[PDB]
Design a protein around this ligand. Structure first.
Ligand SMILES: [Fe+3]
Ligand SMILES: [Fe+3]
Lengths: 192, 192
């Protein structure tokens, strides 16, 4: 059995950038439903004795879809924080300047990739096995965990992530995503 | 250049099953954006001057995604009507009973397929090349027009189609879809 992890902050702590109503549906109903559905699909199978990550790397179909979405959304909630956002500092800023020229060029490329990701999906900042950073987009429950790249930052662009607050304006959601980025989490992901 | 076809009913005519606000966004912003983006992508290319169906059957990528979504939503708006819904009669009722056993069995199988269609997509009633009817689900902009099957009815299950009115309850959206089905349009397509 897998449980829904506690949210790292109060449900209105990301406002006005993501509302408390988007958190009650996205965390309290959508992320809860993926945990329940995962638990029901793996009951009595060999997947019951594996870690979530090992399930994601060895499954397909419905088991994959629910396990990758449990992981992807727990990672997503940790990428956001109250009294954060702004430009990064330290090793993160150096790593971004080195692979993308500057933070302003990285922000522009990530935003563009997130806006253009057609349908439901995720856009990721990853560190490839060679140490360079790159922006990749996945469709639906797709995740960098099935490749050699290490996930550092993600934004959910399934319409449920923003439709209550921004309706069709996915660019407005992305502009406000930058005010919430938890660069401390990204730093821990880069150093691991 | 393509035009956004007018809705065949007023923007509040599907209320309360689909609200006037959902039509304002889904038709007025989302479907309009696909026409503008399609016009922009084909200007000055060999696709300019072909019909929408010819473009859908010969393209891939962004041209395909935008062209298929323009056609798919015009077909969807035509599948819905005020003062309709209920059980089909005539030739449509006979073809549905012959392929699914009964209207109740078809409605149950089409609802299950639309709810389980993971991510953004569409669920379709189609007439196959051998005359039998079948339910098929597509992902993102996918449409039976690229196959040999004739589309008869569709439901949009991208989250924007229902999130304003039903939030995450896609079952509730499908229950209300049945109250809007314009069986005269389905009869027109069954005969084509
Ligand atoms: Fe999500
Ligand atoms: Fe739509």
């Amino acid at each position: 059995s897998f449980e829904l992890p506690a949210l790292p902050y109060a449900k209105d702590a990301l406002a006005p950038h993501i509302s408390a109503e988007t958190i009650e549906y996205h965390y309290g109903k959508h992320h809860q439903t993926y945990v329940t559905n995962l638990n029901n699909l793996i009951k009595g199978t060999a997947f019951e004795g594996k870690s979530l990550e090992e399930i994601i790397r060895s499954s397909e179909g419905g088991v994959f879809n629910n396990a990758a979405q449990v992981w992807n959304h727990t990672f997503y909630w940790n990428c956001l924080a109250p009294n954060a956002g702004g430009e990064p500092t330290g090793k993160v800023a150096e790593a971004i300047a080195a692979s993308f020229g500057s933070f302003a060029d990285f922000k522009a490329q990530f935003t563009d990739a997130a806006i253009k990701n057609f349908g439901s999906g995720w856009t990721w900042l990853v560190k490839n096995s060679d140490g360079k950073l790159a922006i990749v987009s996945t469709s639906n429950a797709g995740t960098p965990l099935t490749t050699d790249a290490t996930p550092l930052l993600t934004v959910d662009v399934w319409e449920h992530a923003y439709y209550i607050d921004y309706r069709n304006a996915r660019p407005g959601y992305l502009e406000h995503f930058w005010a919430l980025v938890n660069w401390e989490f990204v730093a821990k992901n880069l150093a691991a």
